[PDB]
Amino acid sequence: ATADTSPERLAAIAKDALGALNDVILKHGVTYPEYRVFKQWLIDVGEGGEWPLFLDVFIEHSVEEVLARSRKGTMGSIEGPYYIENSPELPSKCTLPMREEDEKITPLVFSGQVTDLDGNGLAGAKVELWHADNDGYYSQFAPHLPEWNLRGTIIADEEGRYEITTIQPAPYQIPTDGPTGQFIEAQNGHPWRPAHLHLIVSAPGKESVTTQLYFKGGEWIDSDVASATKPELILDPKTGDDGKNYVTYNFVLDPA
Amino acid sequence: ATADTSPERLAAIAKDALGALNDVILKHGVTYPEYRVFKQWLIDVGEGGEWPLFLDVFIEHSVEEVLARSRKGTMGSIEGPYYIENSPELPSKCTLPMREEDEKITPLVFSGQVTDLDGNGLAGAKVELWHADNDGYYSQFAPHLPEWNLRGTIIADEEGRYEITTIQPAPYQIPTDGPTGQFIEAQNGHPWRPAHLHLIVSAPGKESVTTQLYFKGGEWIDSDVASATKPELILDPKTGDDGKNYVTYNFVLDPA
Ligand SMILES: Oc1cc(Cl)c(Cl)cc1O
Ligand SMILES: Oc1cc(Cl)c(Cl)cc1O
Ligand SMILES: [Fe+3]
Ligand SMILES: [Fe+3]
């Protein structure tokens, strides 16, 4: 990864970031035993491979918030740590790859349209969808799962429409025993994110959008540990007589 | 390491530390490519074993500053990452262990007295001294060095006096190729600390003091990368006719 940040921009960011942290130590009278625990815990974060988790939980929301200012289309949200590029392509009307341990979960039928700022529908539009199973696991991050379980890139039709059947994911829990979970536990927090779909939506000559969608009534929408929920992103699915849940959600893309 | 910090104290520290960092992202409009570089660099810090270095350079000074408020005796300074417990004991009048590559350096004769707040001299007082050689290396952190090179615990006499001959350390440079050095290089900084002695001074029923001493005229006293220099800690050694440099410095210990 590379960034085009100047020495002077970096200096300025570093000065107030370190200044700020040093200010917090002063305000709170952080002790030497505390400093020692902090040092060991930073070591533990790295040793446990949790920098992607910790940052995406506690920092990414502010980086999306910056990006949001430059965008007129659908609300973005954090990518989080579980995205995988090049998920297998599926047609506009499709069902995500899934196991038999998944086919017993009430189906979720997700429909809608990808458009521009003026509402023109968009051909060649792709919807990359990934989410957790009813167990709260992601494929490629749980060795029991078929590697593209609940992952796909949907090819939207000429009008920019799709109909994807999947399942509702379970809420996600941050493993309690790792450094991040221990950080949360030690301050009496909840290591939970509400149930959510991840989507990256793209189209020719359009700026892609990374977002998440949530479920009205879901537990933890009011207390997402990653501060990544937005009211605009909450789905209210209706139940059909097949007993499946139906929801329509449209994507609006900024020009590239 | 353990600390006795409450869930509520931890919550409060975390809230403003993360809040502060998220505020810096917002103020500066930190980008996704920047966020990605930041994430990789945190990973690299851990992989390179540089959490002790980075924190002691950029954070420890604030933790000593907190501790300083509760102390009436000699000014403290940061421990930094190179302290080693149980260095071999030496008598009140002694010379630090050193090589032949060290005996060619002009000697530094360091004298003084350990006392209490009222100026009463202190028996059973110990002066743990450690510093770098003329090359800027520390023993146990450079495989060529005898493991206690320029390290000792000095036993002060009945009056609390010592006379330790050593050498003046060279200034210290933070390795430029590691994540911390690369952090410094990318913002156009200087990876240098002024030449310094480290001391931990202790006595029966007294609160030990961790401090450093610096050298008038030394380069980088005006720009210590670790912000750990204080005017009270700067030595002005006088040259004798043996051509050795002489300095007197007294330690004043708070009661335990
Ligand atoms: O997408 C995610 C993002 C974060 Cl931060 C967490 Cl904790 C879990 C996720 O499933
Ligand atoms: O004692 C030290 C403390 C720090 Cl922070 C550095 Cl960079 C070098 C040292 O020799
Ligand atoms: Fe997720
Ligand atoms: Fe040092």
Coordinates of C-alpha atoms in Angstrom, one line a residue, chain B residues 95-196:
Chain B
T95 CA 35.1 2.3 36.9
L96 CA 32.3 0.8 34.7
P97 CA 33.1 -2.4 32.9
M98 CA 34.4 -1.6 29.4
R99 CA 36.4 -2.9 26.4
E100 CA 39.7 -1.8 24.8
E101 CA 37.7 -0.2 22.0
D102 CA 36.4 2.0 24.9
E103 CA 39.6 2.8 26.8
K104 CA 40.7 5.1 24.0
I105 CA 37.8 7.5 24.7
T106 CA 38.4 10.4 27.0
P107 CA 37.3 9.3 30.5
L108 CA 34.4 10.8 32.2
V109 CA 34.6 10.9 36.0
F110 CA 31.1 11.1 37.5
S111 CA 30.9 12.0 41.3
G112 CA 28.2 13.0 43.7
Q113 CA 25.9 12.2 46.6
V114 CA 22.5 10.6 47.1
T115 CA 20.4 12.4 49.7
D116 CA 16.8 12.9 51.0
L117 CA 14.5 16.0 50.6
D118 CA 16.1 17.7 53.6
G119 CA 19.6 16.9 52.2
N120 CA 20.5 14.1 54.6
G121 CA 23.0 11.8 52.9
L122 CA 21.8 8.2 52.4
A123 CA 23.6 4.9 53.3
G124 CA 22.9 1.7 51.3
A125 CA 22.2 3.8 48.2
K126 CA 22.6 2.2 44.8
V127 CA 23.2 3.9 41.4
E128 CA 22.3 1.8 38.4
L129 CA 24.1 3.3 35.4
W130 CA 23.8 2.2 31.8
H131 CA 24.7 4.0 28.6
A132 CA 25.9 3.5 25.0
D133 CA 29.5 3.3 23.9
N134 CA 31.3 5.8 21.5
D135 CA 29.7 3.8 18.6
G136 CA 26.1 4.4 20.0
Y137 CA 25.6 0.7 20.9
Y138 CA 24.2 -0.8 24.1
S139 CA 25.4 -4.1 25.6
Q140 CA 22.8 -6.9 25.3
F141 CA 21.5 -5.0 22.2
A142 CA 24.6 -5.5 20.1
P143 CA 26.1 -9.0 19.9
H144 CA 29.7 -7.8 19.8
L145 CA 29.6 -6.3 23.3
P146 CA 30.5 -8.0 26.6
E147 CA 27.1 -8.3 28.2
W148 CA 27.6 -5.7 31.0
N149 CA 29.7 -3.2 28.9
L150 CA 29.0 0.2 30.4
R151 CA 26.5 -1.2 32.9
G152 CA 26.8 -1.4 36.7
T153 CA 25.1 -1.0 40.0
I154 CA 27.2 1.3 42.1
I155 CA 27.1 0.9 45.9
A156 CA 27.2 4.5 47.4
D157 CA 29.2 4.9 50.7
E158 CA 27.9 5.6 54.2
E159 CA 27.4 9.3 53.3
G160 CA 25.7 8.3 50.0
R161 CA 28.6 9.3 47.8
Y162 CA 30.0 7.7 44.6
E163 CA 32.8 8.3 42.0
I164 CA 32.3 6.4 38.8
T165 CA 34.6 6.6 35.9
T166 CA 33.3 5.8 32.5
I167 CA 33.2 7.4 29.0
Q168 CA 30.9 10.0 27.4
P169 CA 28.4 8.1 25.3
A170 CA 27.9 9.0 21.7
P171 CA 24.4 10.4 20.6
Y172 CA 21.9 7.6 19.7
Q173 CA 20.3 7.2 16.2
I174 CA 17.0 5.3 15.7
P175 CA 17.7 2.7 13.0
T176 CA 16.5 4.4 9.8
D177 CA 15.2 1.2 8.0
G178 CA 12.7 0.1 10.6
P179 CA 9.1 1.2 10.8
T180 CA 9.9 3.9 13.4
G181 CA 12.9 5.2 11.4
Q182 CA 10.7 5.1 8.3
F183 CA 8.0 7.0 10.2
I184 CA 10.6 9.7 11.1
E185 CA 12.1 9.7 7.5
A186 CA 8.7 10.1 5.8
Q187 CA 8.0 13.3 7.7
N188 CA 11.5 14.6 7.2
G189 CA 12.6 14.2 10.9
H190 CA 15.9 13.5 12.6
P191 CA 16.2 10.1 14.1
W192 CA 18.6 11.2 16.9
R193 CA 18.7 11.5 20.7
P194 CA 21.5 13.6 22.4
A195 CA 24.4 11.7 24.2
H196 CA 23.0 10.5 27.7

